[PDB]
Amino acid sequence: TSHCRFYENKYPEIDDIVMVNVQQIAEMGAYVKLLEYDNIEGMILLSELSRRRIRSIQK
Amino acid sequence: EDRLQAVVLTDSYETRFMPLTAVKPRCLLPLANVPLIEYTLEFLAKAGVHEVFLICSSHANQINDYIENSKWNLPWSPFKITTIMSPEARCTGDVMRDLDNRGIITGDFILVSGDVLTNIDFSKMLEFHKKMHLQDKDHISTMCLSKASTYPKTRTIEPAAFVLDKSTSRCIYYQDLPLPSSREKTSIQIDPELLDNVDEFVIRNDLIDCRIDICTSHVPLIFQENFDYQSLRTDFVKGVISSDILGKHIYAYLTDEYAVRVESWQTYDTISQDFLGRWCYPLVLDSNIQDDQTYSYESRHIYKEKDVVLAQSCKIGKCTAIGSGTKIGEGTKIENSVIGRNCQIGENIRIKNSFIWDDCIIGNNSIIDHSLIASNATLGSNVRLNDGCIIGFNVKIDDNMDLDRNTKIS
Amino acid sequence: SIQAFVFCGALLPIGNRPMIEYVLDWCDQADGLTSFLSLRKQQFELIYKALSNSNHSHHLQDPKKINFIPSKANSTGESLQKELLPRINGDFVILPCDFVTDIPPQVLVDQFRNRDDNNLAMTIYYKNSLDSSIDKKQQQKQKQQQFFTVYSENEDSERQPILLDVYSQRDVTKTKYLQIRSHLLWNYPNLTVSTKLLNSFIYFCSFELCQLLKLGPQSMSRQASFKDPFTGNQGIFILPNETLFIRANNLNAYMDANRFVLKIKSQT
Amino acid sequence: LEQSFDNSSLISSVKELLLNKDLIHPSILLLTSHLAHYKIVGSIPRCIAMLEVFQIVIKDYQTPKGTTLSRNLTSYLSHQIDLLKKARPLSVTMGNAIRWLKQEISLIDPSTPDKAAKKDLCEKIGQFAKEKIELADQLIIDNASTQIEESTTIVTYGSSKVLTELLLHNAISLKKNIKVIVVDSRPLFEGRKMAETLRNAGVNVMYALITSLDTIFNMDVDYVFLGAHSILSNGFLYSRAGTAMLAMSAKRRNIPVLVCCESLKFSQRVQLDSVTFNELADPNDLVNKNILDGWQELPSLNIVNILYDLTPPEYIKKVITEFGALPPSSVPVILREYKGSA
Secondary structure: OOOOOOOOOOOOOOOOOOOEEOOOEOOOOEOOEEOOOOOOEOOOOOOOOOOOOOOOOOO | OOOEEEEEEOOOOOOOOOOOOOOOOHHHOEOOOOEOHHHHHHHHHHOOEEEEEEEEOOOOHHHHHHHHOOOOOOOOOOOEEEEEEOOOOOOOOHHHHHHHHHOOOOOOEEEEEOOEEEOOOOHHHHHHHHHHHHHOOOEOEEEEEOOOOOOOOOOOOOOEOEEEEOOOOEEEEOOEOOOOOOOOOOOEEOOOOOOOOOOEEEEEOOOOOOOOEEEOOHHHHHHHHOOOOOOOOOOHHHHOOOOOOOOOEOEOEEOOOOEEEOOOHHHHHHHHHHHHOOOOOOOOOOOOOOOOOOOEEOOOOEEEOOOOEOOOOOEEOOOEEEOOOOEOOOOOEEEOOEEOOOOEEOOOOEEEOOOEOOOOEEOOOOOEEOOOOOOOOOOOOOOOOOOOOOOOOOOOOOOOOOOOOOOOOO | OEEOOEOOOOOOOOOOOOHHHHHHHHOOOOOOOOOOOOOOOOOOHHHHHHHHOOOOOOOOOOOOOOOOOOOOOOOHHHHHHOOOOOOOOOEEEOEOOOOOOOOOOHHHHHHHHOOOOOOOOOOEOEEOOOOOOOOOOOOOOOOOEOOEOOOOOOOOOOOOOOOOOOOOOOOOOOOOOOEEOOHHHHOOOEEEEEOOEEOOOOOEOOOHHHHOOOOOOOOOOOOOOOOOOOOOOOOOOOOOOOEOOOOOOOOOOOOOHHHHHHHHOOOO | OOOOOOOOOOOOOOOOOOOOOOOOOHHHHHHHHHHHOOOOOOOHHHHHHHHHHHHHHHHOOOOOOOOOOOOOHHHHHHHHHHHHHHHOOOOHHHHHHHHHHHHHHHOOOOOOOOOHHHHHHHHHHHHHHHHHHHHHHHHHHHHHHHHOOOOEEEEOOOOOOOHHHHHHHHHHHOOOOEEEEOEEOOOOOOHHHHHHHHHHHOOOOOOEEHHHHHHHHOOOOOOEEEEOOEEOOOOOEEEEOOHHHHHHHHHHOOOOEEEEOOOOOEOOOOOOOOOOOOOEOOOOOOOOOOOOOOOOOOOOOOOOOEOEEOOOOOOOOEEEEOOEEEOHHHOHHHHHHOOOOO
């Protein structure tokens, strides 16, 4: 209807390279939605985003 | 110098207030809980006059019953007050030829038309008049006008072009001008033949009329012969400066502060909020002058008399006024709205921007916006008013009824 | 930045100095008076410029491009607009041909500096001066000029007065008899005109050469009808200005310049 | 002469520098004549104005013959600073922008062909005005909006700098009921600039004056907000004068006081007395034949005014910054941990 899969597997199977945007970051890291499976969303860790501690003014 | 005469000429604006005004005149309507004759009368008594002449073109008996029951037919009033009975609906002007046929007026006198409300010290207007006398022997009058420079376009009925002198403020010319709703009529004309020896003049729109003209007794005799005039300024001050009589110049004064006159409800609302706010110092409301009220003044512009029963859990916002003996109820809301004496407000009503007069039993849960209620017109439960309603004197309203914009019910 | 310009309009120098030398080296005395370049036609340049190029100790930097068409053979506006797209470097200033002043133009260029009110063009003027008495001449040619004289009461805008219209003797006062529009009376609600105002022709300028390329404002000749189109709606579009003062300055347009340099302008 | 405070040389009233030693930008002369003649500013309006006129003066390079861009621009821009120094003494939003700007001039390398100089100064100073000003203020809005309940009042003072957007946000963008009271002072009637904007947007503004300050607080009132010009190292606020009287009146009548500030505006210096480090501001403005003419030529008369004075930190309940809320006695920890390092 609106948007759908790439290649008939439900998730990005282990150690592939996709693209996201960061939605909000409070304490878990970002709630990144996957731009390839648009309506789906995952997340990501704070120490994984760079190595630097992210300022709120940088956040 | 002294022995100031005066004449107030009301009862020319009954076209304006037509759902009202057919049971009591325009001059007998309560602006702030008291019928606005004294808003002129206290002013021109502070001006120091010695006689006035109330022209009562309609409802002449319920003028003089109030006048004889006033504080002005008591033997220490600074002027004696006299009336003039009238056949109905005379145009203005011809009242002055009737005056000249009667022949009372000698000396300088106030041509106060309409009903005004002002703070201007008229004493400093005398020396402008006498400087006009000393520096011109061809004078007519002086016309005090306000400087409402921050707003054109919103002084409703007549916009005017008071084009006048730079130096001497002599009124050069005059012309009526159309309305902002009309995009069509776009021109005015000032023909330069009488513009020969002026060399410096100003043309303004930001001067609101207030019809307070003081003159000499020569100009009614001037007005006697030229019997073509029916207005005071659309015809006369044009038809006396337009090279018609030679050697008769008219002057006009500009003040710096508040001086205003009733036109209609889109001016009545504004002057009610200016007077009820502190924009009219010193002629203010809390001084308890007119019919010996008991108004107190909190902050946030609250006016309350004695014996006011404010019920629990009510809130009363900015710029309100409540007369004595009233009764509001639980859950009601008051904001920017004058409330008359001895009424009975019910439950949960949100009165806002509406001028409720005396003895108005308002039913429960019946919210009101701009719907000014005249005397004795009660309401009922769930009567949702809305904007523009000017519901008149003694109008019974049943329950659950809705109204529309400008529904001039009576 | 600033760019100067001179148009083309007794004719001899009276007060032992050419009239062009007055404007060229009295417009540059204080040091915003430094222009980028000035412009002039030829107009028998060997009489004027060969004497006005004296005393080379100020190091006068003069690229002066000479045209031929804006020398009374055409009206100034339509001949001028086709010679401004190759003549653009910033802000423009025009000057008349035989101008004279007494106060230097430092306050003029400063009044053109402090213009944060996103306006277009100030026109610093001055009326007729204090003459003696009733003239021993013919009828009084008082060109009725139409404008906004004094500063308005309202702050945050129009601290210099905004010009509104233009009409004149001999074509409007005998045909249309001083009519004034209502739309131009509501916006700017205090019109104030006078008749002694001498059009000083100074007429500073801005990037309205970058603005005007829409159709309609190219019809102006002799630099008059640029706010005479009110250009509102029937809110308000671009707006020019005006400025004037009280006394202590002089100029000349008509044939009273002889009495001016005789008994009003004495070089002492 | 009993306290001799009128001869405080922290401002110099000399004017009219005619010297053509340097290429002074005409836009910066417009900016100085726009500041000092008719004051239209607060502190971060001065910061944004100074920053977006230094934008233009770096966009118009005009480099000399033999001098590299890394070896001229700080002296040129300091001579650009000197005209503003003559015009009006500098804020901390002036100073903590210009020293950052000089540090970012310093890290350029002598290989720029004066084309990527735009791409690492214009874009970087736009990132400065984004980061340390505007989105920091967005964090101020999103942090202070949770500390206002519906149907309450706010007493600001003067012209706000950031919290005009806070009042507009909580008025319209969150639609909760609010009744702003704006109070200002002679001679810079800059609370009227807030009153026009807020009432034009349609919120219940009720203007006042600081002489009538008693009758504001006798109503239903809480949550005094205050714009800051700087916050000192101790906790002493520093803002437009007349702030501290409503601060001590507000703490006296046990209703809270807040200060909306950002981490660009904290200062390293220190004072505790009010008339120590301060600006005298043009004593002809306190007159408008006038009421009096000529305080000069009359022996033994003076006219003084003060722009800046200090509220003690006992009065401020809560300084709020874009990192979070904090007590005012704890401002050196953000002097040391976050200012400059962020």
